[PDB]
Paper text:
We focus on AMGs that potentially encode chitosanase enzymes that metabolize chitin – a common carbon polymer. One expressed protein showing endo-chitosanase activity (V-Csn) is crystalized and structurally characterized at ultra-high resolution, thus representing the structure of a soil viral AMG product.
Based upon a partial alignment of the V-Csn, A. fumigatus, F. solani, and S. avermitilis sequences, the corresponding residues in V-Csn are D148 and E157. Two V-Csn constructs harboring either a D148N substitution or a E157Q substitution were generated, and the activities of the respective mutant enzymes measured. Activity was reduced five-fold for D148N and almost eliminated for E157Q. Both constructs eluted with gel-filtration chromatography retention times identical to native V-Csn, and circular dichroism spectra indicated both constructs were folded. The two mutant V-Csn proteins were crystallized under the same conditions as the wild-type protein, and their structures were determined by molecular replacement to high resolution.
Author numbering: 0 to 224
The structure:
């Protein structure tokens, strides 16, 4: 059965719809850019990371948005007890408060955690840590994910390296992702709104998805978008 959809927002030519009914959710069909933010091997001096260093900004004291910086504006380098010593600490907007701002463990590791990015100013009621169901209409693959980072306000359709793997999308931060609008993202705003273990939020995503009607309902909905 088709779903009843009501437009709530629009970004970069992609319409965002409230899905009428309960539990509360919104949905959009978009491409999928790779966000390697939070991965502890994303950024390093001299293009040593999985992304080119300049994709995080200027690592010589200029504008650097890839992660935290020291008192002179240079990116914080990981320590001997961090996953990739000497690489830069890459940050995500969602964080684990158990760890300090200079720690890679504070941020969501894009390599290991399925997460979506929502455009800045376009969260549509979702809070970081809320859960989502993500579906690739071309591969039939799906995955639960958290809202883990905030993207440019003018860009939509983006998520983590691990989410790309789960969806069978090229996961390479330098050349992966897709511009084809093949990914359907169903967000449950208000579902979590805090950091918690992946086992816990994945379970909650599973319970919400079951209550909502399951992947079968999202598959039918995908044909409407």
């Amino acid at each position: 059965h088709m779903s009843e959809l009501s437009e709530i927002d629009s970004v970069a030519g992609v319409t965002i719809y409230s899905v009428d009914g309960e539990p509360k959710s919104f949905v959009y069909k978009a491409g999928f850019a790779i966000d390697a933010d939070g991965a502890p091997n994303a950024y390093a001096p001299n293009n040593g990371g999985t992304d080119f260093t300049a994709n995080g900004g200027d690592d010589q004291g200029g504008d650097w948005w890839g992660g935290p910086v020291d008192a002179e504006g240079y990116p914080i380098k990981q320590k001997i007890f961090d996953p990739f010593p000497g690489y830069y600490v890459s940050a995500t907007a969602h964080f684990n408060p158990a760890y300090s701002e200079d720690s890679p463990y504070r941020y969501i590791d894009s390599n290991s955690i399925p997460f979506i990015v929502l455009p800045g100013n376009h969260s549509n009621g979702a809070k970081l840590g809320d859960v989502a169901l993500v579906y690739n209409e071309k591969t039939g693959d799906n995955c639960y994910a958290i809202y883990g980072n905030v993207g440019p306000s003018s860009k939509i359709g983006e998520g983590s390296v691990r989410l790309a793997q789960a969806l069978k999308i090229d996961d390479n931060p330098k050349a992966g992702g897709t511009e084809s609008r093949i990914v359907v993202t169903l967000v449950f705003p208000g579902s979590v709104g805090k950091w918690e273990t992946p086992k816990r939020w994945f379970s909650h995503a599973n319970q919400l998805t079951k209550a909502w009607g399951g992947l079968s309902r999202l598959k039918t909905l995908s044909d409407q978008l």
